[PDB]
Enzyme design. Structure first.
Site, PDB file in Angstrom:
ATOM      1  N   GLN A 192      -7.891  11.300  -9.223  1.00 12.13           N
ATOM      2  CA  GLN A 192      -8.380  12.669  -9.193  1.00 12.13           C
ATOM      3  C   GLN A 192      -9.868  12.707  -8.864  1.00 12.13           C
ATOM      4  O   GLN A 192     -10.317  13.535  -8.076  1.00 12.13           O
ATOM      5  CB  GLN A 192      -8.097  13.347 -10.532  1.00 12.13           C
ATOM      6  CG  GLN A 192      -8.244  14.855 -10.538  1.00 12.13           C
ATOM      7  CD  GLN A 192      -7.797  15.451 -11.855  1.00 12.13           C
ATOM      8  OE1 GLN A 192      -7.280  14.742 -12.719  1.00 12.13           O
ATOM      9  NE2 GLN A 192      -7.987  16.755 -12.016  1.00 12.13           N
TER      10      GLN A 192
ATOM     11  N   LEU B  96       0.423  15.227   0.190  1.00 17.16           N
ATOM     12  CA  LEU B  96       1.154  14.178  -0.515  1.00 17.16           C
ATOM     13  C   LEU B  96       0.282  13.449  -1.532  1.00 17.16           C
ATOM     14  O   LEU B  96       0.623  12.355  -1.981  1.00 17.16           O
ATOM     15  CB  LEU B  96       1.756  13.174   0.478  1.00 17.16           C
ATOM     16  CG  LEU B  96       0.945  12.637   1.661  1.00 17.16           C
ATOM     17  CD1 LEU B  96      -0.135  11.661   1.236  1.00 17.16           C
ATOM     18  CD2 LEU B  96       1.875  11.988   2.672  1.00 17.16           C
ATOM     19  N   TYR B  97      -0.841  14.056  -1.896  1.00 15.28           N
ATOM     20  CA  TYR B  97      -1.682  13.501  -2.945  1.00 15.28           C
ATOM     21  C   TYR B  97      -1.725  14.453  -4.129  1.00 15.28           C
ATOM     22  O   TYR B  97      -2.535  14.296  -5.043  1.00 15.28           O
ATOM     23  CB  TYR B  97      -3.092  13.219  -2.431  1.00 15.28           C
ATOM     24  CG  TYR B  97      -3.595  11.856  -2.836  1.00 15.28           C
ATOM     25  CD1 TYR B  97      -3.897  11.573  -4.161  1.00 15.28           C
ATOM     26  CD2 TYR B  97      -3.743  10.842  -1.900  1.00 15.28           C
ATOM     27  CE1 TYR B  97      -4.346  10.327  -4.541  1.00 15.28           C
ATOM     28  CE2 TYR B  97      -4.193   9.591  -2.269  1.00 15.28           C
ATOM     29  CZ  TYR B  97      -4.492   9.339  -3.591  1.00 15.28           C
ATOM     30  OH  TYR B  97      -4.943   8.096  -3.970  1.00 15.28           O
TER      31      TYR B  97
ATOM     32  N   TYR C 122       2.281  -5.013  -5.058  1.00 14.67           N
ATOM     33  CA  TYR C 122       2.342  -6.197  -4.213  1.00 14.67           C
ATOM     34  C   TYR C 122       1.934  -7.440  -4.991  1.00 14.67           C
ATOM     35  O   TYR C 122       0.967  -7.417  -5.751  1.00 14.67           O
ATOM     36  CB  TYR C 122       1.437  -6.035  -2.987  1.00 14.67           C
ATOM     37  CG  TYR C 122       1.865  -4.953  -2.017  1.00 14.67           C
ATOM     38  CD1 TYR C 122       3.110  -4.347  -2.122  1.00 14.67           C
ATOM     39  CD2 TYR C 122       1.021  -4.543  -0.993  1.00 14.67           C
ATOM     40  CE1 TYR C 122       3.500  -3.359  -1.237  1.00 14.67           C
ATOM     41  CE2 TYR C 122       1.403  -3.557  -0.104  1.00 14.67           C
ATOM     42  CZ  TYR C 122       2.642  -2.969  -0.230  1.00 14.67           C
ATOM     43  OH  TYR C 122       3.027  -1.986   0.653  1.00 14.67           O
TER      44      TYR C 122
ATOM     45  N   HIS D 260     -11.194  13.486  -4.656  1.00 18.13           N
ATOM     46  CA  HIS D 260     -11.754  14.835  -4.627  1.00 18.13           C
ATOM     47  C   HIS D 260     -13.163  14.869  -4.047  1.00 18.13           C
ATOM     48  O   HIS D 260     -13.873  15.864  -4.185  1.00 18.13           O
ATOM     49  CB  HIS D 260     -11.748  15.448  -6.027  1.00 18.13           C
ATOM     50  CG  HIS D 260     -10.452  16.101  -6.391  1.00 18.13           C
ATOM     51  ND1 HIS D 260     -10.277  16.809  -7.560  1.00 18.13           N
ATOM     52  CD2 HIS D 260      -9.267  16.155  -5.738  1.00 18.13           C
ATOM     53  CE1 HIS D 260      -9.039  17.271  -7.612  1.00 18.13           C
ATOM     54  NE2 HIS D 260      -8.406  16.888  -6.518  1.00 18.13           N
TER      55      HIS D 260
ATOM     56  N   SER E 108      -5.001   6.471   4.320  1.00 19.76           N
ATOM     57  CA  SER E 108      -5.923   5.954   3.315  1.00 19.76           C
ATOM     58  C   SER E 108      -6.773   4.795   3.828  1.00 19.76           C
ATOM     59  O   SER E 108      -7.985   4.765   3.616  1.00 19.76           O
ATOM     60  CB  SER E 108      -5.149   5.512   2.073  1.00 19.76           C
ATOM     61  OG  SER E 108      -6.027   5.026   1.073  1.00 19.76           O
TER      62      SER E 108
ATOM     63  N   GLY F  13       1.169   7.912   3.565  1.00 16.17           N
ATOM     64  CA  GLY F  13      -0.129   7.926   2.917  1.00 16.17           C
ATOM     65  C   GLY F  13      -0.976   6.691   3.152  1.00 16.17           C
ATOM     66  O   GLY F  13      -2.204   6.764   3.122  1.00 16.17           O
TER      67      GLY F  13
ATOM     68  N   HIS G 290       1.200  15.671  -9.150  1.00 19.64           N
ATOM     69  CA  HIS G 290       1.390  16.438 -10.376  1.00 19.64           C
ATOM     70  C   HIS G 290       2.257  15.744 -11.440  1.00 19.64           C
ATOM     71  O   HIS G 290       1.980  15.880 -12.631  1.00 19.64           O
ATOM     72  CB  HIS G 290       1.983  17.809 -10.036  1.00 19.64           C
ATOM     73  CG  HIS G 290       1.098  18.647  -9.167  1.00 19.64           C
ATOM     74  ND1 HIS G 290       1.558  19.300  -8.044  1.00 19.64           N
ATOM     75  CD2 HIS G 290      -0.223  18.933  -9.253  1.00 19.64           C
ATOM     76  CE1 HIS G 290       0.559  19.955  -7.478  1.00 19.64           C
ATOM     77  NE2 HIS G 290      -0.532  19.749  -8.192  1.00 19.64           N
TER      78      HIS G 290
ATOM     79  N   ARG H 228      -1.217  -0.510  10.336  1.00 21.44           N
ATOM     80  CA  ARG H 228      -1.120   0.813   9.732  1.00 21.44           C
ATOM     81  C   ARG H 228      -1.976   1.830  10.480  1.00 21.44           C
ATOM     82  O   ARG H 228      -1.706   3.030  10.440  1.00 21.44           O
ATOM     83  CB  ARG H 228      -1.544   0.769   8.262  1.00 21.44           C
ATOM     84  CG  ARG H 228      -0.671  -0.097   7.370  1.00 21.44           C
ATOM     85  CD  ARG H 228       0.632   0.591   7.010  1.00 21.44           C
ATOM     86  NE  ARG H 228       1.239  -0.007   5.824  1.00 21.44           N
ATOM     87  CZ  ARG H 228       2.415   0.356   5.322  1.00 21.44           C
ATOM     88  NH1 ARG H 228       3.120   1.316   5.906  1.00 21.44           N
ATOM     89  NH2 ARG H 228       2.889  -0.243   4.239  1.00 21.44           N
TER      90      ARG H 228
HETATM   91  C1  LIG Z   1      -0.243   8.774  -0.815  1.00 23.55           C
HETATM   92  C2  LIG Z   1      -0.652   7.329  -0.894  1.00 23.55           C
HETATM   93  C3  LIG Z   1       0.043   6.373  -0.157  1.00 23.55           C
HETATM   94  C4  LIG Z   1      -0.306   5.027  -0.204  1.00 23.55           C
HETATM   95  C5  LIG Z   1      -1.365   4.621  -1.004  1.00 23.55           C
HETATM   96  N1  LIG Z   1      -1.738   3.325  -1.082  1.00 23.55           N
HETATM   97  C6  LIG Z   1      -1.009   2.327  -0.537  1.00 23.55           C
HETATM   98  C7  LIG Z   1       0.331   1.963  -1.064  1.00 23.55           C
HETATM   99  F1  LIG Z   1       0.867   2.633  -2.099  1.00 23.55           F
HETATM  100  C8  LIG Z   1       1.029   0.922  -0.465  1.00 23.55           C
HETATM  101  C9  LIG Z   1       0.490   0.220   0.612  1.00 23.55           C
HETATM  102  C10 LIG Z   1      -0.764   0.521   1.139  1.00 23.55           C
HETATM  103  C11 LIG Z   1      -1.536   1.546   0.607  1.00 23.55           C
HETATM  104 CL1  LIG Z   1      -3.151   1.924   1.293  1.00 23.55          CL
HETATM  105  C12 LIG Z   1      -2.104   5.641  -1.786  1.00 23.55           C
HETATM  106  C13 LIG Z   1      -3.259   5.238  -2.666  1.00 23.55           C
HETATM  107  C14 LIG Z   1      -4.558   5.576  -1.981  1.00 23.55           C
HETATM  108  O1  LIG Z   1      -4.947   4.904  -1.043  1.00 23.55           O
HETATM  109  O2  LIG Z   1      -5.289   6.608  -2.387  1.00 23.55           O
HETATM  110  C15 LIG Z   1      -1.719   6.971  -1.706  1.00 23.55           C
END
Ligand SMILES: Cc1ccc(Nc2c(F)cccc2Cl)c(CC(=O)O)c1
Ligand SMILES: *[C@@H]1O[C@H](CO)[C@@H](O[C@@H]2O[C@H](CO)[C@@H](O)[C@H](O)[C@H]2NC(C)=O)[C@H](O)[C@H]1NC(C)=O
Ligand SMILES: *[C@@H]1O[C@H](CO)[C@@H](O[C@@H]2O[C@H](CO)[C@@H](O)[C@H](O)[C@H]2NC(C)=O)[C@H](O)[C@H]1NC(C)=O
Ligand SMILES: CCCCCCCCO[C@@H]1O[C@H](CO)[C@@H](O)[C@H](O)[C@H]1O
Ligand SMILES: CCCCCCCCO[C@@H]1O[C@H](CO)[C@@H](O)[C@H](O)[C@H]1O
Ligand SMILES: Cc1ccc(Nc2c(F)cccc2Cl)c(CC(=O)O)c1
Ligand SMILES: *[C@@H]1O[C@H](CO)[C@@H](O)[C@H](O)[C@H]1NC(C)=O
Ligand SMILES: *[C@@H]1O[C@H](CO)[C@@H](O)[C@H](O)[C@H]1NC(C)=O
Ligand SMILES: *[C@@H]1O[C@H](CO)[C@@H](O)[C@H](O)[C@H]1NC(C)=O
Ligand SMILES: *[C@@H]1O[C@H](CO)[C@@H](O)[C@H](O)[C@H]1NC(C)=O
Lengths: 552, 552
Positions: free
Chosen positions: B172, B353-354, B324, B176, B499, B495, B357, B89
């Site tokens: 949140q 994308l966070y 998972y 933040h 992350s 995302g 809402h 990733r």
């Molecule tokens: C926009 C977003 C996308 C993915 C995740 N977590 C996530 C997921 F939803 C599936 C596989 C790996 C990960 Cl790190 C997250 C959750 C987070 O890490 O804050 C947010």
């Protein structure tokens, strides 16, 4: 007191207290176990048996020139060796950084706060009985005594490697983009928040300062024409703050990125050269990109000059003082298949062993003129008088002093040298031997072994009594020079990791940056990969005089 | 006008202008060559053939639970897969970072200036004919039209994965600490100069703010006792600045690390929980280290809580929303034999994308009460009334909305959702498809394919006309959800790299930090490695109520 005060943990183990009079050593990934991490693992025993000495490596790289002449012309092998040179040195440095002057333990304040110089070794605790932990007397010897006896210059001792004044002022100009001590806070603080080669000594530490120095046309920086020669602009024309004696004429108050480069005309020489180089790359980039605006022409010219700097430092500057017959190579693609962090924090100790005060001559000889320190300081009218051409031609001829060897600090700057001794004490530095063990060196057993000489070593033993109480900085300027070289073992083995980490740990060396598009195409990319101190002068200095870091 | 407005370069190639109407693509290390980097190399052809789709990966990790129950109990294999999860990733993210909102090209201003959110994709040039480059009309559709039609919530659509309000307010509260937009400058600027998990939302962005919140005894943070329950201190007692309606009593104006956590009592809950956790770890560290002073007890407790955060996020927070059957693992030692940059910079697109809402309910149900948005906002007296125990018990029961799927944005916050649409436009974001190709996804061919449904898909085609002009943010909230999941493909695939890079790119995950001594011993080190959202509540919240990110 701290039960960790004694410095018990060996082999980069960490000492943590487990009570008022109890300590524990963390031997995590040190290749050692036991109470103070001293019992070697079997593979560690092997490695300990098979690695040869720094002194062994130095002999090979400084001999067998004919066989190195072969190696220097075999790309793969040449690349192979340079790969090991970069990698093997870059495990000595903690990355991300750990300690600073106020924290002898890892903390988020130590890591996040960029105003700090970082620390290879944590400072001695404030509650330790002696200034070095437990060893030595209550107080360290008088700095004036140490200075006068073994440090101050009697008769001028020239560098055997033949370093000139071009080399001396380059080192001063180059390293002062990240050696900007914040005196208002203390010696353990820096104003260089870039913590590396960002060329802020040309462009400015802040964005506000940069915009004052920029011409905002074709990406160029502001300049003035005197006698038909390109020089930096004035403080009145730009209102960037510069440090000058208030009696200096306004037309002589030049404005550059670093606020103290008006100190000596040697700095203002490179400051003028590196300014001309910017507006030359701008013209070249506009030659290929007529569609580009001022902002992009500037930002691209900066990245190129950053690469130009690193290029010159490795294959010209470091190449010289190393005395290696092996021809070095600035090539980021050697680190792409290796584990390497592209980041760097400037260490207090690296600024410490950079105080190359013996490199400074007794007079500053230009053309047919010999200037004292009093005449050279803050006198840019010297630069206007001779011009850059006569400046380079002269400084390429004048030789510089020997750093190591003892007794070669010019008495004009004695206070500065005594400050280096004092500041290191104020920053609670650990002893010389502790820094040698930290960098995998063998602890000196006597003051004689340190100097390879009896006279100064007897002076030192009367002062410090014990070799494990000897201070780092004065030891560097007296250490037994390596053969016919400018430095000792400790200077190179400590400074080399610090240096190659700040150079290759630059974002432009990362795979996402190291590509032609970043530098405006193959034309701009070529400028970096073909950069040298000779062409830097040939392009910017009138007449294109021969130049080097060595005297002919 | 800018020849690179059409976004010609594919497969992460970089576009550069070579004239007013000419461009060149840099295909350096992209696995492709040709004019726009489209001709695959032979090994790339192979990898392209052998690389399964993200939807393929999602099915495997969400099925075969029984065989995953076996995998979850085989350490090596369990360590092996997570190693691939972390590594595979983390090539999607540029490190060191490249672009920001003002620089569509690499520059030192973009890199060094930490006030910027970085950019996965460079902003569309200001001289481009269309807001997406060359595609679409002169202006994008009315945000209000897009909002009302496909985004706004009709009937409440509950999350199929069973996310609760504990999960909603955690997200949140957690995110933040690095999603602190500098509105005075613009949407592309952050006040989070830490650019990661530094827990400044508990301790403070600056050192000045931190010292106001600390008790300066035993390393603890200041607090007050109300009804026998420990809560944050007041603005009057500390004089740290907080954002409040000036009509709020003084005893209700709590002071925490983040200045806006007084907005909703859900944030003030975790702020209270995470404060209690600090002064709990301090007591434990003083239990082991009676010789330690206040300063070290604090700094060590912070590093532990940083690790506690990352631990919980991976094995509880990310574990849940991933859906998972494979049981995740926070273990830095999986990256030690891997090329990985321990650094991170926050990206504008990750903050975009966070904006979950739809995760927000219609009412806030506590004990036997239903609060509207108007009653919940800036009302900490709700928290004092029920206490943390009834707060956790209730929020663990209340369910949250479905993010993807369309039409689930609560109308009370519609303006906030319309801001997300507007801000992304103001920041010159590239289209949805361009961000999918950027993250190795296949470009959507129709609006229906995106929605997997007909009606919203037609409403969208009437607005944007072309699928290559569809915006990123609204696409996320209307995307065809994965089988009974909360998100679509694009949300996760974009995302997840952002992350896991900000989490593992934390200095405490580096080999020089990840050791017992850093965290005060093995007692403090275990606190991190055993951290969970359940024990975080069990230890700090009265009565130790069962808690989770899932409803029972
Ligand atoms: C926009 C977003 C996308 C993915 C995740 N977590 C996530 C997921 F939803 C599936 C596989 C790996 C990960 Cl790190 C997250 C959750 C987070 O890490 O804050 C947010
Ligand atoms: C980095 O650390 C220094 C020294 O601890 C901080 O400087 C202090 O800041 C406080 C905050 O108001 C002042 O009261 C002190 O007078 C400062 N002391 C010195 C010696 O400068 C500095 O603020 C820290 N930097 C950051 C970004 O937190
Ligand atoms: C990072 O970039 C921002 C935006 O370019 C800089 O903020 C500007 O700073 C100048 C300097 O005086 C001010 O005149 C402007 O008003 C600022 N604009 C905005 C929108 O804030 C900021 O200074 C940069 N940061 C650093 C450390 O250089
Ligand atoms: C293949 C050839 C190997 C030769 C290795 C050179 C070993 C001698 O190296 C010696 O190391 C000493 C250690 O202090 C130094 O004092 C000497 O200056 C140096 O000559
Ligand atoms: C053990 C191997 C099983 C293969 C699992 C993947 C095949 C079914 O995967 C399907 O993929 C589509 C996109 O690729 C999605 O639209 C479906 O919802 C998903 O179930
Ligand atoms: C204090 C110091 C120590 C060593 C070097 N250069 C150097 C050297 F002298 C030998 C081998 C490698 C290197 Cl990088 C330098 C030169 C420099 O990087 O500025 C300074
Ligand atoms: C090192 O270990 C020895 C025993 O292995 C112990 O006696 C000693 O106190 C330790 N510390 C030092 C500084 O020698
Ligand atoms: C500066 O240098 C000039 C030589 O160009 C010299 O005549 C003058 O005395 C110097 N200034 C001072 C203050 O010594
Ligand atoms: C891509 O390459 C083709 C030829 O290979 C060229 O015609 C086209 O202009 C390029 N750009 C785009 C956006 O198709
Ligand atoms: C805050 O919540 C309380 C319930 O504890 C409620 O009575 C009060 O009306 C709320 N405040 C506002 C301004 O609605």
């Amino acid at each position: 007191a701290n039960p960790c005060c004694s410095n018990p943990c060996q082999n980069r183990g960490e000492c943590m207290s487990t009570g008022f009079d109890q300590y524990k050593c963390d031997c995590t990934r040190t290749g050692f176990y036991g109470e103070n991490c001293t019992t070697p693992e079997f593979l560690t025993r092997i490695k300990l048996l098979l690695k040869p000495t720094p002194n062994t490596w130095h002999y090979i790289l400084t001999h067998f020139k004919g066989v190195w002449n072969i190696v220097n012309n075999i790309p793969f092998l040449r690349s192979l060796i340079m790969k090991y040179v970069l990698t093997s040195r870059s495990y000595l440095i903690d990355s991300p950084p750990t300690y600073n002057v106020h924290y002898g333990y890892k903390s988020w304040e130590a890591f996040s706060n960029l105003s700090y110089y970082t620390r290879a070794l944590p400072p001695v605790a404030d509650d330790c009985p002696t200034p070095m932990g437990v060893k030595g007397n209550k107080e360290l010897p008088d700095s004036k005594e140490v200075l006068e006896k073994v440090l101050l210059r009697r008769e001028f001792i020239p560098d055997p490697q033949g370093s000139n004044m071009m080399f001396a002022f380059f080192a001063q100009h180059f390293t002062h983009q990240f050696f900007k001590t914040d005196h208002k806070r203390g010696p353990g603080f820096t104003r260089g928040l870039g913590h590396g080669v960002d060329l802020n000594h040309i462009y400015g530490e802040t964005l506000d300062r940069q915009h004052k120095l920029r011409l905002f046309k074709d990406g160029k920086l502001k300049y003035q024409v005197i006698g038909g020669e390109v020089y930096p602009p004035t403080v009145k024309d730009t209102q960037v703050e510069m440090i000058y004696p208030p009696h200096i004429p306004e037309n002589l108050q030049f404005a550059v990125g670093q606020e103290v480069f008006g100190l000596v005309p040697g700095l203002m020489m490179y400051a003028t050269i590196w300014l001309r180089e910017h507006n030359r790359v701008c013209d070249i980039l506009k030659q290929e990109h007529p569609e580009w605006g001022d902002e992009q022409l500037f930002q691209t010219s900066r990245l190129i000059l950053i690469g130009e700097t690193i290029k010159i430092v490795i294959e010209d500057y470091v190449q010289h003082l190393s005395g290696y017959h092996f021809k070095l190579k600035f090539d980021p693609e050697l680190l792409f298949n290796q584990q390497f962090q592209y980041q760097n924090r400037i260490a207090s100790e690296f600024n410490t062993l950079y105080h190359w005060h013996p490199l400074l001559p007794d007079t500053f000889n230009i053309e047919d003129q010999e200037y004292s320190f009093k005449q050279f300081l803050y006198n840019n009218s010297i630069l206007l008088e001779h011009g850059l051409t006569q400046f380079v031609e002269s400084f390429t001829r004048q030789i510089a002093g020997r750093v190591a060897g003892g007794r070669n600090v010019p008495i004009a700057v004695q206070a500065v040298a005594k400050a280096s001794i004092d500041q290191s004490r104020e920053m609670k530095y650990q002893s010389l031997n502790e820094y040698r063990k930290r960098f995998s060196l063998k602890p000196y057993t006597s003051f004689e072994e340190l100097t390879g000489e009896k006279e100064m070593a007897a002076e030192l033993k009367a002062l410090y009594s014990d070799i494990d109480v000897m201070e780092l900085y004065p030891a560097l300027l007296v250490e037994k020079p390596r053969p016919d070289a400018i430095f000792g073992e400790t200077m190179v083995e400590l400074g080399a990791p610090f240096s190659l980490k700040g150079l290759m740990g630059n974002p432009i060396c990362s795979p996402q940056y190291w590509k032609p598009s970043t530098f405006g195409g193959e034309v701009g990319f070529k400028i970096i990969n073909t950069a040298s101190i000779q062409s830097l002068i040939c392009n910017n200095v009138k007449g294109c005089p021969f130049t080097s870091f060595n005297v002919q």
